[PDB]
Amino acid sequence: TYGIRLRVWGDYACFTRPEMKVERVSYDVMPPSAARGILEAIHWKPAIRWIVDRIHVLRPIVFDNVRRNEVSSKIPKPNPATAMRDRKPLYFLVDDGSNRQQRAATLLRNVDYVIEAHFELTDKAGAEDNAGKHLDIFRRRARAGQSFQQPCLGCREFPASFELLEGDVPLSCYAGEKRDLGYMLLDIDFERDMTPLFFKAVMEDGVITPPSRTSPEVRA
Amino acid sequence: VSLDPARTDRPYLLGRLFAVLEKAQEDAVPGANATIKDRYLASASANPGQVFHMLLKNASNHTAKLRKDPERKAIHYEIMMQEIIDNISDFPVTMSSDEQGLFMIGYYHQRKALFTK
Amino acid sequence: MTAIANRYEFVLLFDVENGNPNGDPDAGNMPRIDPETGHGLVTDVCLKRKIRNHVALTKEGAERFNIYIQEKAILNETHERAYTDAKRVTDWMCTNFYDIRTFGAVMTTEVNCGQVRGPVQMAFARSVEPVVPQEVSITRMAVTTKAEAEDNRTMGRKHIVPYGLYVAHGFISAPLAEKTGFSDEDLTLFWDALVNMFEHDRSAARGLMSSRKLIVFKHQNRLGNAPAHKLFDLVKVSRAEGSSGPARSFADYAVTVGQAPEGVEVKEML
Amino acid sequence: MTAIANRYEFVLLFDVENGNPNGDPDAGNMPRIDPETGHGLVTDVCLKRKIRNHVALTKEGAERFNIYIQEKAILNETHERAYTACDLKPEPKKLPKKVEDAKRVTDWMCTNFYDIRTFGAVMTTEVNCGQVRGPVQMAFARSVEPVVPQEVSITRMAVTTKAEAEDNRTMGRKHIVPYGLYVAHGFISAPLAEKTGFSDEDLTLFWDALVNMFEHDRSAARGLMSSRKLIVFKHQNRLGNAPAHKLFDLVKVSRAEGSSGPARSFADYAVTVGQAPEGVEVKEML
Amino acid sequence: LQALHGYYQRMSADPDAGMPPYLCGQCLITGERQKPIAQLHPSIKGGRDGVRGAQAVASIVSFNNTAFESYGKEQSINAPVSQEAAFSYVTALNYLLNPSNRQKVTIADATVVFWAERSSPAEDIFAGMFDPPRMHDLLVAIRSGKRATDIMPDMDESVRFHVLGLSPNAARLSVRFWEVDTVGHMLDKVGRHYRELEIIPQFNNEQEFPSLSTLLRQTAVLNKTENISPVLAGGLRAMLTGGPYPQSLLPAVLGRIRAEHARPEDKSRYRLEVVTYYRAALIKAYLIRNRKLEVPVSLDPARTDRPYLLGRLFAVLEKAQEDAVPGANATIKDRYLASASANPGQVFHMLLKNASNHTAKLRKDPERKSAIHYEIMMQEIIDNISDFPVTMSSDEQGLFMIGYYHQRKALFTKK
């Protein structure tokens, strides 16, 4: 009863592997990190932490290739004062030689997930901040289709349609299958200088249950 | 029958008429080196109203030749011509590409029928 | 700070005639087509580039409407700056570069990772129905090297989409705007660019591309009032009853919008 | 040479009568068609070539009015001209290391050759002269009704090599469109014109060329080709007052009320030009 | 990949056919905590002696540019793998890339390397199984649906198999596809693929199992290995995953058929065909898999699909042409095939009139009655069609092409 069951689906998705960021390669399934991101796109406040209990993979895994022209560099910081001490044009020209970068992608197609999640109050939570309140607000937003931002399947190019599941979860294509997906991105511990942390993604019956991202025994 | 005798369609009817005319000529003067399908198909499909009249004169002569002999097939060809032209109100000045395709398929449909027992 | 007050959704319909709307660098520059459905495909960043270029031309370096991410088709004749703990620099970047304000950016360094989001978001534009590009063989008069002059003519190839209508979805999130000062003036200029994107983008390759329709679902709440995926469902772009065979002009398509839920409006800019 | 200041769109109508307006290198030499609907096509490249020919014939190589793509030119030898006239040694495979000299060579290429000034060019090959986008663009011409290309077989009563076939004559064939009305759009860009140097003199010459395009293109395979309309939509400012498509649509091409059967002359078509938006003026007088 | 890592751990055990040579974080390869992360990964072999097309110094992980750097981390801390693992995977990849070992094949632009999780004869078979040259008997068996054990008892099909495809991006190389299926399962999938592709040969020198490179080459812009669309090379993942082929395949082969013409530069007696054996095979595969249609291996005159009948009709008209004007340098297949298949209503009238003229010429000449036979075939094919459609779909065009290929082959020396 206490918990959430959010469904998300979309044509495209790209959950890029950390060891293949330069030439994008997607995780076969949405990592908990992505899940968390999606959840925070609907409702979130500093007072609350989202936890992903299970991730259901409903539609089968399918891959596709897309290649895009890209920029090689982050824009440099100007200094506001010296930026105007002598009026100057500021720009970033994608046609100026080294600027141009080509970057392939190995991205999923026709994804469909059911995210089971729940809330947890952060240590900086307000004294009056009820967890039930935030549960209700998120459920309202999910039912009404409201959101802070359109949730995306990893990347902004890939918007995610979503609905709230009040009923029992539908069955997956992998309902009677077992599959070890290897070590994959759990989360990012921003407290511990932003290293990745990984888990053994053993899919079974089409449902993945990762360990708690807040577990002391996972964290250093 | 794949041939659709109930298809009152102008290019289709003209194609059937062409087929029956060719059969009539083939019966009147068998085995010649060239048939009207080989001689007049170009003009026939190009400006039908300008040549179908003379094609009909020739077919009338062929059917007259047939009529003299006991092998009066001639009555079947003449009644076929009567039935086909009955449904046509006027010959077209020109036919488009699709109308010419319909003409060809109608001709080939009617030709198949006449050869069948 | 001022900001737009409502979440917006928009469905942009544009079409191409005998042109290469967006080439595929991984397929010999042939126009992209989706492998899973056969639909033609246009990347969002291809469209964002057009919006950037159009605004750069139109606002010609006005105080609050300069553009960061240029391409070498620009002029340096005139410029000006707004000139209003690292929040100061970020909001200075936002307040005078239209593209950084609208689409977001990333800066080289911060204690943080240096991310700016911007409210606008838009997805891959895909054809309403599958497209089948045609290879066009062309020949040149002269030869480029002296070696190949050893009578003299070279044969090239051009890839064209005979026709195809592309549906481009997009989302404007007001809460993101509130962190970036994306105001109603910016939003109206943005609708202007989306309508006028392809006007200045003429070149040998693209042929004729035009924005035919731009439906805008204007919500009442700061957040939305209905799910975006359900809003997009109302724009039933389907073929006119009188047309059969390949589509070769926008008249071959009939597009209508149903009654959106009472909490969200609709406007047909085009 | 001061640049133009107005955004212009134009619509070109041209005829073909028993001619091959543009041959397809793939279908033997058959006139280009849209295979899925039968409408005839003329590559914008062909019309650009005819414009170039017009320029060369009417100016005959006067200064500021040479053309860059010619029937026997070598591009690198032409780029070395720019490098010499700029006094630079032609950097091997590369631009000059000084950006200002690069700009000067590119501008000399633009300011001299008419068609580089007009249509742009990609000169980054061996001796590198940079890139130009071209203030002027035009799309593929497409017929208003599907064309029916017919195949005409012909014979020659003489043979090139040692042959004994002539026992029948040497056969060859021509492909021709019996008739077809082609609607070719075009575009002129002020912003890029400024960056290139496209002046009103040039523009005048341009409309001239368009009107007189085909008049000097006569050949045994071209038939009788003519320009029927040049509906020009002048915008009153740098950036237009009306979307392009919204102006093209004012130009309506239909078949005359009394015309039936396949079209065989311009008179079978009724051309109507609507009222342009208040920010535009129409000079259909061309 | 950790698959690579496991392969190194496998081969490194033996003293031959391998090699035993040797801040902190979580190693994503192994999953071991607090291990020495590599700051700069060892290089991969590029060039013709490694991954073709890439520069000699190739790499999987490469953060040389500021764009790709993330969460404040630098050159390889973004991709954290222990030193040992880094070495391992690289080495295994390199050993698989050495052509002296049979575990390698080059497809289009990508180089494919495969292995079994433990020693199995599959690793010696798959080298040729998607580049066919006992092996032929095995191929016929698996195309028949027979289990591999019946031809190779030592084939333990429960062994897991891996296939990897690497494409070059200058110094960077990219993963195009990846399969980890079992030997038996993917062997059956390849069997099904070859079963779908099966078509009667056009000339008896063409091979029974068309090499995938030959199939791809035939869709190339100029019938050379370069100009193969890399996306189509990657799409034909569909061969051994068992899924639908990429939807861009049929329009690609149809585009080749449009833009092709019979080059007599082969210098054989025959002028090169437009619908070659391989293009028809690809069209058959696309129609069987994506469209779920039924397509025979040879002509089936007991059929009633208008697209198929029109393809057969086009074939007989082409035969009549090539008999009426022998040795000509061009034929309707060079020009009107593209528009006949896509828009029958506009062109079949002229083709039929031209065929009428051809039969006219043939009747007076010798062959005085094949002049009759072709007209009988036109009768019996046209008899089943009610109208010429205004336009035809892409898959209808595919059926047109298959019918044309069938009726052409069954008519080379019928008369």
XYZ file of C-alpha atoms in Angstrom, chain E residues 126 129-130 139 142-143 183-197 209 238-242 245 289:
29
model
C 30.968 -19.216 -37.309
C 28.856 -19.374 -41.337
C 28.184 -15.680 -42.062
C 24.817 -25.133 -43.736
C 20.781 -26.025 -40.355
C 18.870 -24.398 -43.222
C 25.337 -21.731 -29.899
C 22.298 -23.854 -30.678
C 19.817 -20.984 -30.558
C 21.692 -18.544 -32.787
C 22.748 -21.366 -35.098
C 19.044 -22.105 -35.555
C 18.430 -18.389 -36.137
C 21.096 -18.284 -38.856
C 19.470 -21.371 -40.330
C 16.145 -19.555 -40.454
C 17.839 -16.554 -42.074
C 19.360 -18.687 -44.830
C 15.988 -20.409 -45.240
C 14.274 -17.060 -45.818
C 16.957 -15.902 -48.254
C 24.537 -19.492 -49.423
C 18.669 -8.932 -37.724
C 20.358 -11.980 -39.256
C 21.205 -13.637 -35.931
C 18.812 -12.012 -33.474
C 15.905 -13.394 -35.502
C 15.229 -6.766 -40.981
C 9.987 -11.644 -42.309
